[PDB]
Design an enzyme around this catalytic site. Structure first.
Site, PDB file in Angstrom:
ATOM      1  CD1 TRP A   1      -5.314  -2.418  -6.637  1.00 53.33           C
ATOM      2  CD2 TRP A   1      -3.343  -2.164  -7.661  1.00 53.33           C
ATOM      3  NE1 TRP A   1      -4.504  -1.678  -5.815  1.00 53.33           N
ATOM      4  CE2 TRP A   1      -3.289  -1.511  -6.419  1.00 53.33           C
ATOM      5  CE3 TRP A   1      -2.214  -2.139  -8.481  1.00 53.33           C
ATOM      6  CZ2 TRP A   1      -2.150  -0.841  -5.979  1.00 53.33           C
ATOM      7  CZ3 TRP A   1      -1.090  -1.468  -8.045  1.00 53.33           C
ATOM      8  CH2 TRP A   1      -1.064  -0.834  -6.805  1.00 53.33           C
ATOM      9  CD1 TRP A   2     -11.917  -5.112  -5.733  1.00 57.30           C
ATOM     10  CD2 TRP A   2     -11.625  -6.556  -4.032  1.00 57.30           C
ATOM     11  NE1 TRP A   2     -13.074  -5.104  -4.951  1.00 57.30           N
ATOM     12  CE2 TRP A   2     -12.946  -6.021  -3.951  1.00 57.30           C
ATOM     13  CE3 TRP A   2     -11.232  -7.499  -3.095  1.00 57.30           C
ATOM     14  CZ2 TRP A   2     -13.837  -6.353  -2.933  1.00 57.30           C
ATOM     15  CZ3 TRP A   2     -12.125  -7.850  -2.100  1.00 57.30           C
ATOM     16  CH2 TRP A   2     -13.421  -7.262  -2.022  1.00 57.30           C
TER      17      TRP A   2
ATOM     18  CG  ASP B   1      -0.291   3.503  -9.031  1.00 57.34           C
ATOM     19  OD1 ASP B   1       0.892   3.321  -9.327  1.00 57.34           O
ATOM     20  OD2 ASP B   1      -0.747   3.256  -7.911  1.00 57.34           O
ATOM     21  CG  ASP B   2      -2.300   7.429  -6.897  1.00 57.29           C
ATOM     22  OD1 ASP B   2      -3.111   6.721  -7.521  1.00 57.29           O
ATOM     23  OD2 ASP B   2      -2.487   7.827  -5.732  1.00 57.29           O
TER      24      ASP B   2
ATOM     25  N   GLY C   1       0.480  -2.629  -1.956  1.00 54.28           N
ATOM     26  CA  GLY C   1       0.544  -1.434  -2.804  1.00 54.28           C
ATOM     27  C   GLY C   1      -0.047  -0.188  -2.195  1.00 54.28           C
TER      28      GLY C   1
HETATM   29  C1  LIG Z   1      -3.766   1.449  -8.583  1.00 60.13           C
HETATM   30  C2  LIG Z   1      -4.038   2.100  -7.237  1.00 60.13           C
HETATM   31  O1  LIG Z   1      -5.064   1.815  -6.599  1.00 60.13           O
HETATM   32  N1  LIG Z   1      -3.102   3.008  -6.745  1.00 60.13           N
HETATM   33  C3  LIG Z   1      -3.324   3.593  -5.386  1.00 60.13           C
HETATM   34  C4  LIG Z   1      -4.698   4.193  -5.347  1.00 60.13           C
HETATM   35  N2  LIG Z   1      -4.939   4.982  -6.298  1.00 60.13           N
HETATM   36  O2  LIG Z   1      -6.175   5.563  -6.322  1.00 60.13           O
HETATM   37  O3  LIG Z   1      -5.709   3.978  -4.340  1.00 60.13           O
HETATM   38  C5  LIG Z   1      -5.402   2.979  -3.357  1.00 60.13           C
HETATM   39  C6  LIG Z   1      -6.323   3.218  -2.149  1.00 60.13           C
HETATM   40  O4  LIG Z   1      -6.087   4.585  -1.695  1.00 60.13           O
HETATM   41  C7  LIG Z   1      -3.920   3.098  -3.009  1.00 60.13           C
HETATM   42  O5  LIG Z   1      -3.638   2.226  -1.909  1.00 60.13           O
HETATM   43  C8  LIG Z   1      -3.085   2.642  -4.208  1.00 60.13           C
HETATM   44  O6  LIG Z   1      -1.673   2.702  -3.901  1.00 60.13           O
END
Ligand SMILES: CC(=O)N[C@H]1/C(=N/O)O[C@H](CO)[C@@H](O)[C@@H]1O
Length: 635
Positions: free
Chosen positions: A327-328, A232-233, A125
């Site tokens: 989601w770690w 997200d994001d 992800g």
């Molecule tokens: C749910 C989530 O974590 N979405 C993004 C993220 N959002 O802040 O930070 C991670 C680290 O930069 C990204 O790799 C993810 O794609």
């Protein structure tokens, strides 16, 4: 055994793997498990394999744990038993059985085992180059060996995952690749979860809802049986929680609960960690109340990057009215891309299994290198009560690179911190040598004599680093791993050479010292050249290594000895520690930018591009001096 089993009784007898054996339940057990058993008995006592309810395992029905994915495993002198509570449990029994077998021998053991967390695995992800198809094939097999049952596909930079081409089916080639990934996932008992990321430009209309469902239908035709929608994001209308929940429920009611065989349906919320939540706003309570109860909701903890605490998960669970699917965000390095994060997995509360629906790790764009953390997460999520940070790290490394385990330990031990970053997340590094370092340096700086044993420890450390780097460079057991890390291994070797030379400076006469000093300068320039030519990504380009303890030690020692030399010999040697070709607070070079660390003279005339201070277009003007903070050039 990794993950460690829930219960294990060991007899300290061992037995031979049967040369002649009677197999029972072969035709009726999970075929995936039978195939694994058949490879182990390749070349070749009763052996009973089956799921609770099969005739083969009737005698053991009371010993088979009553848990999803549970199994009973037995080895004694008279027979072997491999008995799952369900088909996946049988497969898992076999993966434990495979670790017991060593040089045609088995220990007399009895295991009752099951996972503490229901969904366990990996979300691909991250931002950055998506994993290669071959790397994904390798990952899937790795997940099955470690009882990870979940792979969520969602690379931020896949245009058919995210906006705008989320609406388009995958091209034929990519489609056939995903089709193969699903088949391989199925054979390794992993749910391939296909995620979509539509929220940045979704319209809340029939047109976009239908395109999303049509896209899910195309993925279903490719063999996909679990699905996720990520929000997200993003900003704008796609952040509306009522609409998100209506869309997820529609997908649930018109798609997931309508197909014959769909498994997981997961969403990632816009407010996906506490710091990015509005405690006073209605977003998370709206999802909690409106989202259909079978739908999973993801959470990264108190912050984007954070470890999972009892208090932290209580906070979210109270609002979403279900156990969060974690989601770690480790070892993902997409925001510190000049670093490799190869240290142990730790910091997560080990008593809160009942409070989570799932636990997945978001890894590095470096697929093989991520296996250290992935192996450890698999161990943690399966048996968090027995989770052993260091032993599992060591076990992972020995698994990934048996022919050079100690060398990889050495490299990983000093490549684990992230350095300063906007997420505030840090890891320990080089903890073994940290005390001998801080002591050596404190004494040295003050004019007090340092312990010889401390000087030897540093010496011994630099020696081991060079052996490790040169051995890793030439290793052919896991070539993809070596390819990923190679630029870091070069930088790591330079670091150690630089350490040895600096230590020689602390140690004879003026001429000798000057040789060492010039050598150090050359090694600094080499490090700069690696930092400028390798891993040139737009965000954090270059290659940093041993940054927490080892490089600061070397740098500070170097600066100190040069100072003492300058006082003794009334000299003016340059004490600066990072090579910089341009002259000026340290300057930095990043891609074609020259910046002053938050008048300048370049080593040559370049065409100017622009200047930004906190802006003016230079329209290609020849430039060598900038007087009055970033200068962009053509390079
Ligand atoms: C749910 C989530 O974590 N979405 C993004 C993220 N959002 O802040 O930070 C991670 C680290 O930069 C990204 O790799 C993810 O794609």
């Amino acid at each position: 055994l990794q993950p460690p089993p829930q219960q294990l009784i060991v007899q300290n007898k061992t037995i031979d793997l049967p040369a002649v054996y009677q197999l029972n339940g072969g035709e009726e057990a999970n075929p995936h498990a039978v195939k694994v058993l058949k490879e182990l008995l390749s070349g070749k006592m009763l052996i009973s394999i089956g799921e609770k309810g099969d005739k083969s395992v009737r005698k053991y029905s009371r010993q088979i744990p009553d848990h999803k994915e549970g199994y009973y495993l037995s080895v004694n002198e008279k027979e072997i038993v491999l008995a799952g509570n369900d088909e996946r449990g049988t497969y898992y029994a076999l993966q434990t059985f495979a670790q017991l077998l060593k040089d045609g021998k088995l220990p007399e053991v009895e295991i009752k085992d099951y996972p503490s967390v229901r969904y366990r695995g990996v979300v691909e992800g991250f931002y950055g180059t998506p994993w290669s198809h071959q790397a994904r094939l390798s990952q899937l097999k790795f997940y099955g060996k470690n009882k990870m049952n979940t792979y969520i596909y969602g690379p931020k930079d896949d245009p058919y995952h995210s906006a705008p081409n989320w609406r388009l089916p995958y091209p034929d080639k990519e489609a056939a690749q995903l089709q193969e990934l699903v088949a391989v996932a199925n054979e390794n008992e992993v749910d391939f979860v296909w995620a979509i990321h539509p929220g940045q430009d979704i319209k809340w209309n029939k047109e976009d809802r239908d395109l999303l469902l049509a896209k899910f239908e195309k993925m279903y035709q490719l063999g996909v049986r679990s699905f996720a929608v990520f929000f997200d994001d993003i900003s704008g209308e796609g952040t509306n929680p009522q609409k998100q929940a209506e869309l997820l429920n529609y997908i649930d009611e018109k798609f997931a609960q309508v197909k014959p065989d769909i498994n997981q349906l997961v969403m990632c919320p816009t407010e996906y960690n506490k710091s990015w939540s509005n405690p006073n706003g209605n977003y998370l309570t709206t999802l909690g109340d409106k989202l259909n109860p079978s739908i999973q909701i993801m959470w990264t903890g108190d912050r984007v990057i954070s470890d999972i605490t009892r208090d932290g998960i209580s906070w979210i669970n109270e609002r979403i009215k279900r156990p969060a699917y974690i989601w770690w965000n480790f070892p993902v390095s997409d925001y510190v891309r000049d670093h490799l994060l190869l240290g142990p997995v730790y910091g997560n509360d080990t008593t809160i299994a009942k409070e989570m629906s799932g636990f997945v790790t978001n890894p590095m764009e470096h697929a093989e290198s991520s296996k250290i953390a992935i192996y450890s997460v698999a161990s943690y999520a399966w048996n968090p009560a027995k989770y052993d940070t260091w032993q599992t790290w060591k076990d992972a490394i020995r698994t990934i690179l048996p022919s050079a385990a100690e060398e990889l330990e050495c490299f990983a031990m000093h490549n684990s911190d992230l350095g300063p970053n906007g997420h505030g997340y840090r890891r320990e590094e080089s903890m073994d040598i940290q005390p001998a370092a801080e002591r050596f340096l404190k004494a040295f700086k003050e004019g007090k004599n340092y312990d010889k044993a401390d000087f030897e420890t540093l010496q011994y450390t630099f020696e081991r680093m060079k052996e490790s780097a040169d051995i890793l460079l030439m290793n052919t057991e896991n070539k993809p791993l070596i390819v990923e890390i190679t630029p870091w291994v070069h930088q790591f070797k330079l670091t150690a050479e630089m350490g040895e030379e600096v230590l020689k400076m602390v140690e004879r006469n003026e001429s000798y010292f000057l040789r060492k000093y010039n050598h150090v300068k050359a090694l600094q320039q080499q490090m700069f050249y690696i930092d400028q030519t390798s891993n040139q990504n737009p965000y954090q380009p270059g290659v940093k290594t041993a940054t927490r303890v080892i490089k600061p030690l070397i740098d500070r020692t170097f600066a100190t000895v040069v100072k003492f030399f300058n006082q003794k010999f009334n000299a003016h040697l340059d004490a600066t520690t990072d090579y910089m070709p341009h002259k000026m607070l340290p300057l930095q070079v990043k891609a074609n930018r020259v910046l002053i660390s938050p008048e300048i003279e370049l080593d040559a005339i370049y065409p100017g591009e622009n200047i930004q201070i906190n802006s003016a277009g230079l329209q290609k003007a020849p430039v060598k001096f900038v007087r009055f903070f970033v200068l962009t050039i053509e390079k």
